[PDB]
Design a protein around this ligand. Sequence first.
Ligand SMILES: [K+]
Length: 114
Amino acid sequence: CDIPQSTNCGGNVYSNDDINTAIQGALDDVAXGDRPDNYPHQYYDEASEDITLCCGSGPWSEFPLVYNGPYYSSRDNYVSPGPDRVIYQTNTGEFCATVTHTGAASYDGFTQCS
Ligand SMILES: [K+]
Protein backbone atom coordinates (compact mmCIF):
# COMPACT_ATOMS: atom_id res chain seq x y z
CA CYS A 1 0.00 0.00 0.00
CA ASP A 2 1.03 3.65 0.02
CA ILE A 3 3.82 4.57 2.42
CA PRO A 4 2.23 6.36 5.44
CA GLN A 5 3.14 9.99 6.19
CA SER A 6 4.49 8.94 9.59
CA THR A 7 5.03 5.81 11.65
CA ASN A 8 5.76 5.34 15.36
CA CYS A 9 8.03 2.36 16.05
CA GLY A 10 8.18 2.00 19.84
CA GLY A 11 8.77 5.76 20.26
CA ASN A 12 10.99 6.28 17.20
CA VAL A 13 8.90 8.32 14.78
CA TYR A 14 9.86 7.95 11.12
CA SER A 15 8.60 9.83 8.09
CA ASN A 16 7.46 8.63 4.70
CA ASP A 17 10.88 9.80 3.43
CA ASP A 18 12.68 7.58 5.97
CA ILE A 19 10.62 4.56 4.88
CA ASN A 20 11.13 5.24 1.14
CA THR A 21 14.85 5.70 1.79
CA ALA A 22 14.97 2.27 3.49
CA ILE A 23 13.17 0.51 0.60
CA GLN A 24 15.31 2.24 -2.03
CA GLY A 25 18.43 1.29 -0.05
CA ALA A 26 17.26 -2.33 0.03
CA LEU A 27 16.66 -2.31 -3.72
CA ASP A 28 19.97 -0.64 -4.68
CA ASP A 29 21.89 -3.67 -6.04
CA VAL A 30 23.77 -1.72 -8.78
CA ALA A 31 27.60 -1.36 -8.68
CA UNK A 32 29.40 1.75 -7.45
CA GLY A 33 28.36 1.56 -2.59
CA ASP A 34 28.10 -2.04 -1.36
CA ARG A 35 24.84 -3.56 -0.20
CA PRO A 36 24.74 -3.95 3.59
CA ASP A 37 25.80 -7.15 5.25
CA ASN A 38 22.76 -9.33 6.17
CA TYR A 39 20.18 -7.00 4.55
CA PRO A 40 17.72 -6.99 2.94
CA HIS A 41 16.69 -10.50 3.96
CA GLN A 42 13.51 -12.53 3.77
CA TYR A 43 10.81 -11.41 6.22
CA TYR A 44 9.35 -14.36 8.14
CA ASP A 45 5.74 -13.75 9.17
CA GLU A 46 5.12 -15.43 12.54
CA ALA A 47 1.56 -17.00 12.94
CA SER A 48 1.54 -16.17 16.68
CA GLU A 49 2.42 -12.53 16.03
CA ASP A 50 -0.13 -10.05 14.74
CA ILE A 51 1.56 -8.24 11.91
CA THR A 52 -0.76 -7.00 9.15
CA LEU A 53 0.94 -6.52 5.77
CA CYS A 54 -0.71 -4.14 3.32
CA CYS A 55 1.03 -5.41 0.10
CA GLY A 56 -0.55 -8.82 -0.69
CA SER A 57 1.42 -11.91 -1.64
CA GLY A 58 4.98 -12.61 -0.70
CA PRO A 59 7.84 -12.93 -1.21
CA TRP A 60 8.63 -10.30 1.42
CA SER A 61 11.87 -8.66 2.47
CA GLU A 62 12.99 -6.72 5.50
CA PHE A 63 15.46 -3.82 5.76
CA PRO A 64 16.45 -1.66 8.73
CA LEU A 65 14.53 1.57 9.29
CA VAL A 66 16.99 4.21 10.50
CA TYR A 67 17.33 7.98 10.52
CA ASN A 68 19.29 9.57 7.68
CA GLY A 69 19.35 6.33 5.75
CA PRO A 70 19.78 4.05 4.07
CA TYR A 71 21.26 1.68 6.60
CA TYR A 72 24.69 0.29 5.78
CA SER A 73 26.98 -2.08 7.68
CA SER A 74 29.79 -4.52 7.15
CA ARG A 75 31.78 -6.76 9.44
CA ASP A 76 34.73 -4.34 9.06
CA ASN A 77 32.61 -1.21 9.71
CA TYR A 78 29.67 -2.40 11.70
CA VAL A 79 26.49 -0.51 12.59
CA SER A 80 23.61 -2.10 14.46
CA PRO A 81 20.42 -2.39 12.42
CA GLY A 82 18.57 -1.29 15.53
CA PRO A 83 15.09 -2.47 16.43
CA ASP A 84 13.04 -1.01 13.54
CA ARG A 85 12.30 -2.49 10.12
CA VAL A 86 10.50 -1.83 6.90
CA ILE A 87 8.85 -4.82 5.20
CA TYR A 88 8.40 -4.62 1.44
CA GLN A 89 7.45 -6.96 -1.40
CA THR A 90 10.70 -8.40 -2.72
CA ASN A 91 9.79 -8.38 -6.41
CA THR A 92 7.79 -5.14 -6.71
CA GLY A 93 9.23 -2.88 -3.97
CA GLU A 94 5.70 -2.27 -2.67
CA PHE A 95 5.51 -1.14 0.96
CA CYS A 96 4.02 -3.76 3.32
CA ALA A 97 4.54 -2.61 6.91
CA THR A 98 6.83 -1.16 9.52
CA VAL A 99 7.60 -3.39 12.49
CA THR A 100 9.85 -3.22 15.54
CA HIS A 101 11.60 -5.43 18.05
CA THR A 102 10.84 -2.76 20.66
CA GLY A 103 8.12 -3.99 23.02
CA ALA A 104 7.97 -7.43 21.39
CA ALA A 105 7.36 -10.71 23.25
CA SER A 106 11.07 -11.51 23.15
CA TYR A 107 14.35 -10.11 21.82
CA ASP A 108 13.77 -11.58 18.31
CA GLY A 109 9.99 -10.91 18.14
CA PHE A 110 8.12 -8.16 16.33
CA THR A 111 5.26 -5.88 17.04
CA GLN A 112 3.67 -3.58 14.48
CA CYS A 113 4.54 0.12 14.44
CA SER A 114 1.58 2.47 14.69
K1 LIG B 1 24.67 -0.80 -4.41
